[PDB]
Design a protein around this ligand. Structure first.
Ligand SMILES: O=C1N[C@H](C(=O)O)c2c1c1c3ccccc3[nH]c1c1[nH]c3ccccc3c21
Length: 514
């Protein structure tokens, strides 16, 4: 009959669309997610420690850890000639259960394939997720956007009113194409096949030699990962496709065992390096793949999209509540593009590592001449810095925003402006991270002078703000300055042992007004 009314219309029900939905939900912003219900892309099971911190904010981290990934399954990354052949190099990474509890984060990375993450994110989001719904089209108006969604379950079509429209329609984003925004390739496009197969006993056979992922060194086409998706029988084999040999043949090539193998799917997927020239066109925005696609080498892809959705999340709400400066939305691209590009390059440095590593003559050679050749590689491989692909704390946490709303100061955790406020335990159950996520938060160590001042400045502009006084010195040390200001996203916006005189000039700068 009449149009639907919501502030933010999310296009794309994948992890990123859901993340934006969860954060917006926690900021009390009315939204609606439409997913055609009907994405040829890498497989993607890992969730970085930074994304796990965001899900902690949203109360779903636990559900993700108990989703189904077995706790006694290895997390090792192993380089081999074949899965069951000679092992060349290995990075022990323990199991989910028994492993060193991280010191720089309260939430270590996690495993949760799509056939588990999807239902999770769906329930956490609830009714505001309209599955099996297709966007017919969208027209942009002066103060809002108008779309048309067809309920693919009933056939009915419905018009939707919305202050803003955010698209997460993947790397092929129609919305981006429609907005006439381009995303030229930052690096060469390669082709790969994702062979999903089931090996009921593959794990039993391997035993202690199992691994979250196996890097193959068997051929030009078979020198790519073989991952345990659910550590319960499901596996994915990546194989390189020259520019242009059978599914079951290949899998049987990768695995040295004579055990039951059932191929479930075998599909192509382009590996691309594309960052959109723009992240928005007026009232329509772009997140995740639609704005920045990278190589899955390092799992930076999804974390950068979830990291971007969260940034757009509090900037959308702020403009909606009316307290952000008219220039704050513009900062989404100003801060998130450079991160996407930095993560893109590093992902590429991991991809290159694998492509350039030429494979020796008698590598899969048995007995010593071979044991020695393989030993050789195990060293050059480590010399090439393989571990970087799995231990990259600088990509997960190390991203400092240099922008018009961070009073900048001209790996190891820093409370440096534009950076993510470091982790520290205030109590064995509450991390400092747990204070960030709502509105601005002012931290003070020892002193409390000048706080009544800021409290009012922010209050002058309705800018939500919380002030916390902390005491232990370890944290005070870690954060350095006496007064640290954290944005709704948990990144430092300013710090110093003394609050500057005209606070209005400050509040206005951080909210993106002046
Ligand atoms: O397809 C993938 N799927 C994996 C993914 O989902 O990113 C993946 C994939 C590939 C991958 C695929 C082709 C060539 C090199 C590659 N490195 C990787 C990866 N390196 C990682 C490090 C940590 C976590 C995941 C990966 C990874």
């Amino acid at each position: 009959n009449a149009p639907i009314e919501t502030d933010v219309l999310i296009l794309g029900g994948g992890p990123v669309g859901m993340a934006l939905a969860l954060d917006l939900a926690h900021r009390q912003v009315g939204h609606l997610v439409v997913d055609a219900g009907d994405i040829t892309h890498p497989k993607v099971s890992t969730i970085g420690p930074r994304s796990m911190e965001l899900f902690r904010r949203w109360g779903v981290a636990k559900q993700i850890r108990t989703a189904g990934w077995p706790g006694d399954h290895p997390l090792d990354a192993a380089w081999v000639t074949r899965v069951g052949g000679h092992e060349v190099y290995r990075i022990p990474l323990g199991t989910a259960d028994t492993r060193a509890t991280p010191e720089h984060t309260p939430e270590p990375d996690a495993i949760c394939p799509a056939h588990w993450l999807a239902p999770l994110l769906a329930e956490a989001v609830g009714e505001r997720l309209r599955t099996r719904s297709r966007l017919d089209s969208f027209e942009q108006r002066d103060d809002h956007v108008r779309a048309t969604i067809t309920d693919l379950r009933t056939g009915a079509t419905r018009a939707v009113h919305a202050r803003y429209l955010v698209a997460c329609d993947g790397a092929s984003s129609p919305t981006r194409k429609a907005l006439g925004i381009d995303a030229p390739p930052r690096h060469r496009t390669q082709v790969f096949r994702n062979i999903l197969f089931r090996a009921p006993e593959l794990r039993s056979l391997l035993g202690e030699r199992a691994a979250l992922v196996f890097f193959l060194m068997l051929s030009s086409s078979l020198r790519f990962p073989l991952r345990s998706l659910d550590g319960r029988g499901l596996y994915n084999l990546v194989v390189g496709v020259d520019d242009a040999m059978d599914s079951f043949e290949l899998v049987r090539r990768a695995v040295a065992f004579d055990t039951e193998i059932e191929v479930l799917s075998d599909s192509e997927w382009h590996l691309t390096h594309r960052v959109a020239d723009s992240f928005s066109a007026g009232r329509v925005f772009l997140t995740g793949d639609a704005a920045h696609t990278l190589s899955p080498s390092g799992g930076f892809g999804m974390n950068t999209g979830i990291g971007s959705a969260a940034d757009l999340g509090w900037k959308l709400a702020a403009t909606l509540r009316g307290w952000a400066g008219p220039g704050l939305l513009a900062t989404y691209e100003e801060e998130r593009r450079p991160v996407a590009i930095t993560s893109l390059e590093e992902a590429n440095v991991n991809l290159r590592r694998t492509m350039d590593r030429e494979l020796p003559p008698g590598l899969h050679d048995d007995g010593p001449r071979g044991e020695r050749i393989r030993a050789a590689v195990a060293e050059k491989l480590e010399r090439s810095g393989a571990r970087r692909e799995f231990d990259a704390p600088g990509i997960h946490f190390g991203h400092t925003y240099r922008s018009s709303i961070v009073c900048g100061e001209p790996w190891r955790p820093s409370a440096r402006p534009g950076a993510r406020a470091p982790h520290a335990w205030l109590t064995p159950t509450t991390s400092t991270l747990d204070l960030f996520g709502r509105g601005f938060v002012l931290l003070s160590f020892g002193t409390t002078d000048g706080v009544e001042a800021v409290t009012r400045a922010f209050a002058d502009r309705h800018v939500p703000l919380e002030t916390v006084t902390c005491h232990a010195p370890e944290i005070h040390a870690l954060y350095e300055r006496a007064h640290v200001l954290v944005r709704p996203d948990g990144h430092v916006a300013w710090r110093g042992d003394h609050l500057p005189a005209e606070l209005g000039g400050l509040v206005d700068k951080v909210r993106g007004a002046a």
